[PDB]
Amino acid sequence: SAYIWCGWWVMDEIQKMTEEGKDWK
Amino acid sequence: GMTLTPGSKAGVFDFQDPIDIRGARWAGESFKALLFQIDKEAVEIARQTG
C-alpha cells in the first residue's frame, strides 16, 4: 500500500460526511 | 499582501481554518499560531514605515 499524510481536518470532513448521510469519504 | 498564507481568507485569522493555525490542534497549538500572525504583521510594518 501507500502513505498519504492527511490531517484531522480531512478526517473532520470525512466524519462529517458519513455521519450526515453523504456518499464518499 | 505580503503576509498572506496563500490558502487564507485575506484579512481574517480564524482558528477553524487549518491553514491559518498551521494545522494546529487543541489550544496551546492553536493560540500560539495567532502569536505567529501578530508577529508577521508587526514585522511587515517595519518594511512599509521604514
| Beta-carbon-side half-sphere exposure of residue A25 (alpha carbons within 13 Å) | 15
Retrieve residue A19's grid coordinates. Answer: 455521519
- Rounded-to-integer distance, Cα B34 and Cα B39, Å: 9
Distance between terminal CA atoms of chain A?
A: 18
- Rounded-to-integer distance, Cα B18 and Cα B15, Å: 7
Instruction: Tell me how close the Cα of B43 comes to any Cα of chain A, in angstroms.
Output: 29
A8 touches chain B (CB under 8 A): yes
B18 touches chain A (CB under 8 A): yes
Among B5, B18, B9, B28, smallest CA distance to A10 is for: B18
Q: Compute the Cα dihedral for B4, B13, B30, B46 and give only its sign.
A: positive
